[model samples]
Target: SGPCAKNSSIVGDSFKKAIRERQTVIYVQLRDACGDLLSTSDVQAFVISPDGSTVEVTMTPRENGIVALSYYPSIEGSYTLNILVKGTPISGCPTTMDIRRG
Candidate 1:
């Protein structure tokens, strides 16, 4: 059984290359199937580098259903951005969004 009936995912700019020592921003957005903002508590954003180093952003939710994280990657390789919503229940099983460097 699944908490969410369906799930969708997308990555912003699916492919990107960055010069060494350069800084980039990855924007991520999550939405529910019903077109409502996915409600989250104690949500955390993390960027994991190919070398295993992790950069994290702790966001405090604001009006208009926006959770923002500012990430600065220090290496030039593929990175994985993970959004983890912490707490009990974990009612929402599937989250949809685009994550990419800018």
Candidate 2:
């Protein structure tokens, strides 16, 4: 099979909706072109806050190509999330995350 290395290979619930404060996690899974899980240590993530400030994101890798991205949203606005594998952007990357204050 070809390289299934794209942002579309990353799937998770965090991409579904707006997240509120105190909810400190965004999860995703990585898969290959063959519809199989991918496990690697070259994953990177970052978050751009509404104020144009860049925040470092934490990623926890687990078995079965599962990755948990954790970040603290201190503002109520839109956050641009960027995920990269080996310096290349995954599909659906640079995803927008809406932050709400309630």
Candidate 3:
């Protein structure tokens, strides 16, 4: 099997509160069987702020099979992000990172 899976979503924080007055850093790490960073041609990342602001960043899977994403929160509220992955034999492993600040 060549690790051909379906699309999925991973929720980071489940607290329904506005995250404000804080600098948030988001990091995503991906790896393969050989412990090497794997890069998919159909992998995309984005961040949706509480006020419906969308921030998008292109991720290049590292040689260590890991991808790191970083972002700062400019607003305080509940936010949801969607990771769009394309291509056939699609492996949808969407991950989310929730941040809360007072």
Candidate 4:
């Protein structure tokens, strides 16, 4: 199991790029099928290492139903970001990254 939580404020077209050892601030937002934002609440979260180890994390709250997550990866290998809402996986549930030197 990985970290669970809610929300993001960064909205735009998605882009894919190699991290190249650059640390990232993992953030996400919650919205419905009609493109409406969701409310904030206590959340559960984890950061899953490549070898299948989970680290629990707490989500930060922002205005407009944006719940942000913080991930400064310390392990080498691909990492996946998983967030579940109402028992269903979010659109970017499994965001993978190559966690190593470029």
TM-score of 2: 0.79
At residue 87, candidate 1 shows an lDDT of 27
Cα lDDT tens digits for candidate 2, 1-102 = 322447334465555456566547776677766667764466778888889999767788777678887888888888888877777777777778888876
Q: Write the per-residue lDDT of candidate 3 for residues 10-45, one digit (tens) a residue.
A: 224432233565545444444343434444655566
TM-score of each candidate?
0.51, 0.79, 0.53, 0.65
Clashes (N, CA, C under 3 Å) per candidate: 0, 5, 12, 10
Scored by TM-score, the top model is 2
Per-candidate RMSD, Å: 6.6, 2.8, 5.3, 5.6
Q: After superposition, how far is residue 2 of candidate 3 from its true place, in Å?
A: 9.5
Model 1 lDDT tens row, 22-73 = 4444333444546465554445566667677776555654444455555566
**Better candidate number, 1 or 2, judged by TM-score:** 2
Give the runs in model 3 whose Cα sits over 4 Å from its true position: 1-23, 29-41, 56-60, 87-98
Clashes of 2: 5
Clash-forming residue pairs, model 4 = 2-46, 3-45, 3-46, 4-44, 4-45, 7-28, 7-29, 7-67, 8-28, 8-29
For model 4 the local lDDT of residue 76 reads: 69
Tens digits of per-residue lDDT, candidate 4, 3-102, equal 2333322343231222434445555666655566664443444567678888455678777567666665566677766666655456655566566655
Q: Which stretches of candidate 1 lie over 4 Å from their true place?
A: 1-23, 30-34, 38-40, 58-60, 86-102
Alpha-carbon lDDT, every model: 0.45, 0.71, 0.47, 0.55
